[PDB]
Symmetry: D2
Amino acid sequence: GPTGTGESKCPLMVKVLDAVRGSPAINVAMHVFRKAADDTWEPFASGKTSESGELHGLTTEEEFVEGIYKVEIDTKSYWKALGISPFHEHAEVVFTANDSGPRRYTIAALLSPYSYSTTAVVTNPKE
Amino acid sequence: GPTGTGESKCPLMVKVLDAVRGSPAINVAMHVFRKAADDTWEPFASGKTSESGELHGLTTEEEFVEGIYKVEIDTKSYWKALGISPFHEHAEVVFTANDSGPRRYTIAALLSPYSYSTTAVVTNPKE
Amino acid sequence: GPTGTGESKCPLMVKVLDAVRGSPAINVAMHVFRKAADDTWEPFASGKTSESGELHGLTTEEEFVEGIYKVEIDTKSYWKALGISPFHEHAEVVFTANDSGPRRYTIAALLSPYSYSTTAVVTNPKE
Amino acid sequence: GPTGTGESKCPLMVKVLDAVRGSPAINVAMHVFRKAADDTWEPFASGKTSESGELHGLTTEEEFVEGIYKVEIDTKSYWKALGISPFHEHAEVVFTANDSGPRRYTIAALLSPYSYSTTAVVTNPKE
């Protein structure tokens, strides 16, 4: 069931890989925003990837209602810390969530200094 | 491309490909913005891809000064036209331009219903 | 420790995602080959992805010795079963394994009818 | 491209890009093979990328009949030249050509030390 600001079925998970080192991307900062009624972007959640390159517990089933969400990935900080001057300021993922009921979302991203790819895996909830 | 203040000596080019059909992505709309003092996004250029999946003559070299730019691609419309329910609201590319100062950029986007990848090719004005 | 033809630390794992449906790629066949002394490709292991789009237990630490390995992914069968006529016959991953001691390898692949991407995550063994 | 029996009306083109430096991948060697009766791979064409990361004039339309082709890219040499230890031995693209019969193909490869992606653009000879 729901929860309220932590980690229901884990309705939203993010995974990041580094294509240069062949490893999980660790300590990568991320901010999530939701489009508010007035049409602006409101802060929703933030965190950093673990040593496994994942970010879990951003929200709960109860709190993750229908709307348009934006996941901002701080790729620039990550490359600079390694001595590389990257092309993008950050990577962005914008999507509509739960318009036909609750779903679980896994966002995956693969990073290179001059290129990034993002994909999503969507599942119909629990079994 | 002619020139002057915005559109075609072509310091900025965009190419879009479709990974489902294996062809150029045609009639794809896009808007270009420039970050202003206030941190908001100012309108700069726009167009739609040609039959070869390309967009040229967006700007000119005199107009295209050092700044942070955002390319927003209407991928959602593209897939809805083909009768497919896509995941992303749109695709965004945010980057810092010039550095050496004036420079030539190629932005490529590869689209799939639940995924997208983008790369930049930066060329030699520079020295 | 080792084992002998099943599943040590799980020295080799494969994960496949479908970019068209936004889901794990299930029932995807794969064959692994190792380059023999005589320079030919010898059968090493085979299996099919689970409902989670993963293939575990292909070998053990003991059996996965130094060499050049080839992972053949049967992408053509997978698309045909969905009614799509894809471009590639199959996808191939060729690499040298354990030349500086035992490592754990995760091979990930993202599929589209006309495009595929593959990446690897390599780890230094157990903790 | 001239023509005759193999090399340049250009039914087959290959483009290679570097995701680490954001530029065309130059001087990349590649071999093209055609599957014969015996199921072994017969030599068909070869070359290395130009300063724009492209290879044209591999074959001619008369020579390029329906069959299964394999493009093998020496990515390993490319990275070793730049002082980087790559994961793959090489990159391979295996596909069936013609169907409508005669047709025009563009194969693009995006390279990273531990990752690679490939897409095909197929054009209209066909009808």
